Write a protein that binds this ligand. Sequence first.
Ligand code: NAG
Lengths: 172, 54
Amino acid sequence: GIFGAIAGFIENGWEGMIDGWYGFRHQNSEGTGQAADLKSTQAAIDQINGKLNRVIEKTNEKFHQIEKEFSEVEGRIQDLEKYVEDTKIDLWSYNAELLVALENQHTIDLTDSEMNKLFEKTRRQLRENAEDMGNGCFKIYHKCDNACIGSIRNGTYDHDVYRDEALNNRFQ
Amino acid sequence: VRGLSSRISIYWTIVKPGDILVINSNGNLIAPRGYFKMRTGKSSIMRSDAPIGT
Ligand SMILES: *[C@@H]1O[C@H](CO)[C@@H](O)[C@H](O)[C@H]1NC(C)=O
C-alpha cells in the first residue's frame, strides 16, 4: 500500500481482532489485552460504503431498442446493427474493468492510510514518553497500567504526568 | 404453402390527424377494415422460450 503500514511496517493482521478493523494490543504490568479503535474502523467503512453507493446505484432504464439476434443473412444493415452493439459492449466492458481496478487500488490505499493515521495520532499523543520500535509498536518508558493504556485509547492521556519518569528511563 | 402457390403482400400506411387516406384499385386489393390506434410509451417485444412466472 502507498503508506507502507498494512503489509509493510506492520508485519501482519490480527485474526483475533473481531470487533473492529483497527486496534491496539498492549503489554504491561497487569498482562496483555486488545481493543478495537471505533473511529478509524468507521472511517474506512464509511468511505467504502460511499464507493458502494456510487456503484450499486440505480441502473438506467431502457425499453424498445434495436434487435441483436438474427435468423437470416441480410448484409449491410445487419452488419451495422451488430457493429453498433459490439462497439457498445466493448466500451462498457472496458469501463467496468477500469472501474473495478481503480476502486480496488484506492480501497487498498485508503485502508492503508487509516492504519497509518491511527499510528501517527498515537505517536503524537505519547510525545517524549515513548519510542517507535519500527514494527508498529511503541515502547512506553513508564509504568502504564490498564487505565493508563485506556487513556491512550480514549485520547485523554496526559503526557506531562509521566514525562519526568519517562525521560529518566529513556536517557541513561 | 398450405395448398397455394399464391401470395399476399402486406403493407402499411400511417395517416396523421388532418391528413386523409385514399385507396385506389382496379384489382388485387386486400382491403383494411379499419385502423389500429397508435400509442407511444415503454412498450416492446422479445424472443424467448422462458416460462412466465408469478
Ligand atoms: C476513558 O475516558 C473516560 C472519560 O474521561 C475515563 O473515565 C476513563 O478512565 C478512560 N478509560 C480508561 C479505561 O481509563
